[PDB]
Scaffold this motif. Structure first.
Motif, PDB file in Angstrom:
ATOM      1  N   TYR A  77       0.849  -1.175   0.000  1.00 16.17           N
ATOM      2  CA  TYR A  77       0.000   0.000   0.000  1.00 16.17           C
ATOM      3  C   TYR A  77       0.872   1.207   0.000  1.00 16.17           C
ATOM      4  O   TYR A  77       1.984   1.204   0.590  1.00 16.17           O
TER       5      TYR A  77
ATOM      6  N   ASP B 153      -1.375  -6.293   6.110  1.00 13.69           N
ATOM      7  CA  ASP B 153      -2.622  -7.006   5.837  1.00 13.69           C
ATOM      8  C   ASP B 153      -3.808  -6.036   5.924  1.00 13.69           C
ATOM      9  O   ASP B 153      -3.623  -4.828   6.141  1.00 13.69           O
ATOM     10  N   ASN B 154      -5.004  -6.554   5.689  1.00 19.45           N
ATOM     11  CA  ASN B 154      -6.188  -5.721   5.653  1.00 19.45           C
ATOM     12  C   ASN B 154      -6.498  -5.075   6.990  1.00 19.45           C
ATOM     13  O   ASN B 154      -6.809  -3.881   7.033  1.00 19.45           O
ATOM     14  N   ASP B 155      -6.441  -5.879   8.059  1.00 21.30           N
ATOM     15  CA  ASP B 155      -6.683  -5.411   9.435  1.00 21.30           C
ATOM     16  C   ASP B 155      -5.784  -4.205   9.726  1.00 21.30           C
ATOM     17  O   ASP B 155      -6.217  -3.226  10.304  1.00 21.30           O
TER      18      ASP B 155
ATOM     19  N   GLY C 245      -6.245  -0.756   7.472  1.00 23.40           N
ATOM     20  CA  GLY C 245      -7.530  -0.210   7.941  1.00 23.40           C
ATOM     21  C   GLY C 245      -7.440   0.467   9.293  1.00 23.40           C
ATOM     22  O   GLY C 245      -7.995   1.555   9.488  1.00 23.40           O
TER      23      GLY C 245
ATOM     24  N   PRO D  28      -3.791   0.771  -2.642  1.00 21.33           N
ATOM     25  CA  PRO D  28      -3.023  -0.457  -2.832  1.00 21.33           C
ATOM     26  C   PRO D  28      -2.156  -0.350  -4.075  1.00 21.33           C
ATOM     27  O   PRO D  28      -2.536   0.320  -5.042  1.00 21.33           O
TER      28      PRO D  28
END
Lengths: 82, 80, 80, 81
Positions: A7, A57-59, A62, A80
Motif C-alpha cells: 500500500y 494485511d487488511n486489518d 484499515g 493499494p
C-alpha cells in the motif's frame, strides 16, 4: 491469497506541535510494516507531507487509516499497489 | 499561479514504460522539488513519489501524459 | 556475496554531469533499492541518496566511475 | 550564514537507539528539510537520510550528539565543499 499486500499512503499534516506528535506516535506504533517513510516539510505552507510504503494485511492498513483520519489537521490518502 | 502538488506514480517494470516516464519527468524537472523511486521487484513494479510546485496547466499536462503511458497509473493530490 | 551500501551524491547543475550520473545509474539499476533526488536550486546543485544491495566489486566500480565525473562528489557508506 | 548539510545515519533496531535518535531529531526539526527512513530488516537496521539548512553550532551539535549514541553511525557532508 491472504498474503500481505503493498500500500501507498500519502499524509498531509498541518505542521503544528500536536498534529505532528500524534501522527508520529501512530507511525511508531505501526512501524513493523512500514518499508519506506519520506517526510518533506512545506514551510511556506506550515504543512508537512509524508509518503509511506507498507506491506501489510487488511486489518492493519484499515486500523492505520482510521486512526490517522481521526487526527485533527491531517489528511490521508491510502492506495493499494494492486 | 503555482501551488504544491503531490504525485504518486506506479509503474509496471517494463523497459519502455521506465524510459517514457523518465523522459517525461526530465522534461518537467524544473517544477519537481523532490523525487523518490522505490522498486517493488517482488511485484515487478516501481513506485515514484513527486512533490511539485507548479500551476494547473503544468500539473494537468504532466499527469495526463503520465497516465497515457502503458503500465503507468498516476494519482495527483493538491497540497492545499 | 551481496551487502547493503548507501551512496550519497552531490552534483553541480551542469547538463552533462546530470546526464552522465543518470546514464551510469541506469547501468546499475538492478542493484538500486531506493533513490531519492532533492534539488537545491538556490545552490544550483542536486542531491541524490541511494541504497544498493550488491557485491564489493560492483559498488567499487560504480563509486569509482561517479567520482571521475566533473562536478560530482560521491560518498559510499557500507551498511554493515 | 546557514548552509546545507547532508547526514546519513545507520541505526540498529533497539528501543533505546531508535528513541534516542528520534528525540534528538525532534529537537532539530526546525532546520530539517527532508527526512527519509528506510529500514533494512534483513540486517535488523534502519537508514535515515537528512538534508538540513543550518548554522555551524547546530550542525556540530547534531552530528556530535548522533556520533555518541551506541548503535548509531553517522556521516555528515556539506553540500558545498
Amino acid at each position: 491469497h491472504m498474503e500481505k499486500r503493498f500500500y501507498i499512503l500519502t499524509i498531509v499534516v498541518e505542521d503544528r506541535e500536536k498534529a505532528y506528535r500524534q501522527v508520529n506516535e501512530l507511525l511508531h506504533n505501526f512501524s513493523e510494516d512500514i518499508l519506506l517513510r519520506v517526510g518533506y516539510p512545506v514551510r511556506e505552507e506550515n504543512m508537512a507531507i509524508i509518503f509511506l510504503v507498507l506491506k501489510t494485511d487488511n486489518d492493519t492498513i484499515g486500523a492505520l487509516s482510521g486512526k490517522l483520519g481521526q487526527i485533527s489537521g491531517v489528511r490521508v490518502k491510502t492506495v493499494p499497489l494492486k
